[PDB]
Amino acid sequence: MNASDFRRRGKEMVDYMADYLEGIEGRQVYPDVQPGYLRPLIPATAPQEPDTFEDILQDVEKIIMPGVTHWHSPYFFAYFPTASSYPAMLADMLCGAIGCIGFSWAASPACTELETVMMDWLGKMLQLPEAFLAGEAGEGGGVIQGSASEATLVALLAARTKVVRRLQAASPGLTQGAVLEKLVAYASDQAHSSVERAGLIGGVKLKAIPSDGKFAMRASALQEALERDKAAGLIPFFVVATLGTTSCCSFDNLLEVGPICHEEDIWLHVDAAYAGSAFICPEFRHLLNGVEFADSFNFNPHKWLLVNFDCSAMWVKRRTDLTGAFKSGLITDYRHWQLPLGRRFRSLKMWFVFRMYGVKGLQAYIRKHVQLSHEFEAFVLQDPRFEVCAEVTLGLVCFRLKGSDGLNEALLERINSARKIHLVPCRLRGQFVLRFAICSRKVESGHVRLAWEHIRGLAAELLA
């Protein structure tokens, strides 16, 4: 079709989007569709002749929607939030229209330059040390990665390469294969699975560092592991410290870990995928104290900062430390900052979001969510039948019906079968725990109260 048709159709799509989001509260959050349901509802072959937009759009309602899990219903309380905001959407539309591939500066200077500048804005909102800012003459800078799992993998590969170079440039005969055999990487036992994948791909060993009572990685445990391993002939080289674990949203001790990785000369990567967004708020910024020591810091604006998915923010103090694994001031070659060669004009989304919401708007959004999270915690704290399993700092609450894991597995089964709200569990020291996460952009105190009541009702029934 041509421009004229797109004005028509494109505008129809906008109303569709608005309708879907406007009425999302009337959607059943989790689907009843069975695995493999879709293939039989669709032809076996692409059509030879065109189909009608109208026809395709109703297929969306009648066939696709039944297999959709609505992350944006205020009743979606699973995992962590995924971002979705009108400003990013508008931006995404533009990005697609300009349709450039920023694999090189010449392919579109702006695709590259807006990114560096936006990463600096965000860097400043987080109050990161100047060492991470590109500016006009800093050895550091930031880049948009596809996801936190990729950011982590990129850091590990940069670390791996850096340690192999140092070792070979000090031991002539030395082969890389030799160095890999003894390379060890560490992460909290609460670390995300993206770390294992990273070690797996990078071809190195990964060890877990037992966490403390507050589920945090401490200097003590880390040091022990290091000594134990150096003494065994191994070579520590990478450590991922997590800020806002996926289990209970706890925080590794950065002021204790940073100094250790520094003195031991270990690449320290900080994965704050979820909690990172909160650091633009003074109240929480302390949680990030210690970045000073990090070689690379990452968090997902596509989780809790309203920038629609496909937007993870990563910073490093020495651009060449990163650039070297795939080979000041202005950056022109992002292709040495990530795994793939191509990339979209993703920074448009950050720009539209940061500009259309403003810093204050963003801070409010986060606080409202943390407020809602504490309201839920209160409910649980008020009912003697339940218990709150971990300190509640941000938008996640881990609760439990006082009793056995069997009793709790049961409550969960009854909650999901009821199809009103959607929750996910996790194990916290082997114990079965239920997670309550504030997600949707449009969640209100009302949704939480109703959600709690519904859970309390089911627990009661189950208890009789």
Next chain:
Amino acid sequence: MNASDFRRRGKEMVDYMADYLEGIEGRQVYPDVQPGYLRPLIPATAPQEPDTFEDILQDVEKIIMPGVTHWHSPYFFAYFPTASSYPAMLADMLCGAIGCIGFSWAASPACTELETVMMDWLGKMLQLPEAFLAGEAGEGGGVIQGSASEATLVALLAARTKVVRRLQAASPGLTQGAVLEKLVAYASDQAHSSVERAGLIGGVKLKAIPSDGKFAMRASALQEALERDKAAGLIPFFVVATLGTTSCCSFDNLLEVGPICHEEDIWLHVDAAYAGSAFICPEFRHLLNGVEFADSFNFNPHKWLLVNFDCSAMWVKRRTDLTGAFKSGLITDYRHWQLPLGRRFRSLKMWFVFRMYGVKGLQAYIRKHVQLSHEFEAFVLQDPRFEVCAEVTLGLVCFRLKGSDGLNEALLERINSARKIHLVPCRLRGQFVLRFAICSRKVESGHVRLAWEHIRGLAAELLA
């Protein structure tokens, strides 16, 4: 903002998109902006209070656009085409509205199931062997990757893992570090750089296979390299065969390479990033004869098949051969098929495109482009002052002004400085060559004739 505002603003954005594309022919293809131009035209900090959509949109025209390289101007004849169609755009808008993250089947069954089905449609359009189709009981299947460079890397990692396992299943007690040291991978000397990055990340050795007169990889050269290396104690394990090299769009011999990789038991990956789209046309399908032998096949619909960037299609005959590196019929866990854990509902784009254009529409688009490419070749063939450097099969023509490399470097400099059209050169056996690639969706015979005339004029001037 809320749904109401988005209907307004969102519709404005649609007209903006339509205007930009509608008037793109009046845009200067390549920018005059200097590196680093943007930072000083934007504030140093994100705004505290909201900004106006109206204000943001004019900033787009006045500040972003001057730094944009217009890939969709019919006068953009660089690299290879990047896709952009209204159907994919409409689809992308929807994808963002639904906004789910398909990291697991439960996160949204449809995000996963539509993908498998679409990959089968495309698989059939290409007339791939049934072995690659998921169907209801095939060990194979296809997945959308972020790009051809990632597809290649994924294949190599799958290969690496598979050969390390076999070698230990043979000599129980064999270390991985040991096996990597001797692992060798091959690619044509015309292969894309994504292959080197892959070998670099995977930590193995990569060797180039000298190409023939038609710049193709032949059985002879490959076999020679293999023997030479096995005999030296090395272990061949991965071979990338390219269909549509970026230099002159030549084709490795798949009927010669497949059998070799089979008997030698080497993982054979086929990178047809650009040329692959043409295979939905019977006339060209022979170029793909030999996939039968491939372990993995890949091409970019986001290049020459109108599915907006962020859409590379990859197929394998044994899903577990792929799944194993990151650990029939219906597929539920795409997370073991790619590097990252998260993913967008990208298949919506393929669906909208395939349905709104229909197979015949797609075939016409490709043929029209190949027709235009041959029209250009004709022009060059008609002028005794120039020469065509390689067989012209698809949308690319490599030409040259008869003379020295210096003379040609000069023509190129004069073409880019003129700012009418945009071309890129490359070296073909050390010789400086100019590339002419049909890209934009809206290119016509008229654009090509004017482009040729303009180049002939500049060549003439220069020749005096």
